Amino acid sequence: AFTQAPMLEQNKQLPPVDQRLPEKPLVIKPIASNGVYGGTLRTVMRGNADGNGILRTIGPQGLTHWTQDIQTVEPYVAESYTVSPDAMEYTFKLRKGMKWSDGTPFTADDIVFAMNDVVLNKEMFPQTPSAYLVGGKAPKVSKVDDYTVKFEFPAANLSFPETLATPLGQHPTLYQKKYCSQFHPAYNKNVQAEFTKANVKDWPSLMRAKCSDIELPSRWSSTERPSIDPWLIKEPYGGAVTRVVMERNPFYWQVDPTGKQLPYVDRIQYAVVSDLQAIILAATNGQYDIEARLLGSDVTSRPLMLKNQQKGGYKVFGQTSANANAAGLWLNQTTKNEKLRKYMTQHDFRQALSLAMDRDEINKVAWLGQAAPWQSGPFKESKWYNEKLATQYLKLDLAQANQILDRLGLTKRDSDGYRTYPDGGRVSLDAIVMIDRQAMVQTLELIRRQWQKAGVELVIKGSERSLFYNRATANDYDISIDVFPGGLDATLNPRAYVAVHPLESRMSLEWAKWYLSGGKQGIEPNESMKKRMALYDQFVAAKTQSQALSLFKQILQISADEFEVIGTVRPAVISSLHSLKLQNVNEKMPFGWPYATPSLSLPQQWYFS
């Protein structure tokens, strides 16, 4: 029934293609055209700790997969799934006859092993990955038959199919029972014997070294770890290698609509390059068939990328980042500065700071005019769009900023012209920033000059990553600048709207610590934030789509009313490229880690014309 790549037909030692495929392979409809076999995809990683560059090239092979427009998911590794009307139980049907890369059967036993003996095993994971929890509670995972697996959660868990389409939700398909059980004491009663050979103290360390985890280097550094990936490691991603090579999985489990077993492309070759400038040089000379991850953020490179398209033989395409803001101001409402805190906690003070900002200037200078003014809210293309959350207080209005600050009682000036607190002291805010993030540093320098005209002093505290994070978790900052997620991914990454992320909800990480500790640690949030946290717990456990929509829209509305975080610009278009010869790249796909882009575009159906 099916056909195969010439390089596999060249291999007389493989089983027949019909026996390498499942009985019912997943049929992949191409982005643009039915493809032809062959070729080597040339791409690039920066340094030797860039393993997600492989994952975002080949794609997580999860139980479900995002649609191209990322509005929902469809069965992927699973042939089909069902959900109970209370949304607590998900049952997945697997593809009979599907095989791992080593030709052995892929069955419910593998999913149940991955969940019950790895993911939910507390020696392996003392903290269970949140992808498999609802309100912090784990499901019961059970084998129904050789090709059916059931997940039973203790509360409704409507987001689970979406979670299973993200890179962090792929554990269910990551662990082959046969191979991995060798390193597990419930199966290998002599496993302690493997420890010294592998230089490990315990079996979780052995399991991580041999069988790995979503983002561990060990995922890509061995050639013997079985997978269901479209290409397989052949020259591995060691810590000092200069190139990685992957080759088609002869047991890949998908066909195109003509019955060709995928992928079309035979091999992927990754250059490992230490200097981002050398990557830009190579890319703008056409040496990569795809680069849609590393170059797109450096707006300084777009002019040369565009100019050299004809010379290099490539096409630039623009992608919309999922992030709502490229460099947003997180205002710390639990700042230890008691005089400042009296104003930081006032909505109108935060409003005044936003009105004193000139986002057109920030865009022109920091982003070469390629971004656009924006606050924190989802984009119009998102079902979560809230006009107020997106666009309030965006236009420069220095007169109104000063009117508000006068009304708040900050009229007395010091000898330098700055406003002072009633009790004395310059109105001054410390902003922490990671020094190597140049556009963010430049953004803060611009805001510093702009806020001077409102009589407010911004003190830039740039540092390397460790001190930047240590300052945040120590509650030692007034402002922190970093991205606002939520343009497209608001429910996946809600950190700007409700203080649930322990490192990044920097309207107050002490508030987040209170939320995550059941109120025993951290600092009790204000009523509007406690209300959102309660709504968020209700949302995660919502029993119907309509209830979930209502609850999360309410969170976004309260966030808009409170105006806790101040956006500068939504990201410029992400400049990506592919060779003109490379077909079936979805140039309309969004950009983002939750969709593992560019692999969202189904690289197994890219092909060379």
Residue numbers in the entry: 2 to 610
The authors write:
SPH1118 has been identified as a pectin-binding protein involved in both pectin chemotaxis and assimilation. SPH1118 shows high homology with the solute-binding protein (SBP) associated with the bacterial ABC transporter. SPH1118 consisted of two domains with a large cleft between the domains and substrates bound to positively charged and aromatic residues in the cleft through hydrogen bond and stacking interactions.
The space group of this crystal was C2221. One molecule was included in the asymmetric unit of the crystal. Residues 1 and 611–619 were unable to be assigned because of the poor electron density map. SPH1118 consisted of 21 α-helices and 5 β-sheets built from 15 β-strands. The C terminus of the C terminal domain (residues 573–610, Fig. 2a cyan) in SPH1118 formed a small additional domain and was located in the direction of the N terminal domain. SPH1118 is the first example of SBP in cluster C that binds to polysaccharide such as pectin. The surface electrostatic potentials of SPH1118 calculated at pH 7.0 showed that the cleft between the two domains was positively charged. The crystallization conditions of SPH1118 (open form), SPH1118 (full open form), and SPH1118 (closed form) contained the substrates (ΔtriGalUA or sodium PG). However, no substrates were bound to SPH1118 in these structures. The crystal structures of SPH1118 (full open form) and SPH1118 (closed form) were obtained only under crystallization conditions in the presence of sodium PG. Conversely, the crystal structure of SPH1118 (open form) was obtained under several different conditions other than those shown in Supplementary Table 2, indicating that SPH1118 (open form) was likely to have a more stable conformation than any other substrate-free conformation.
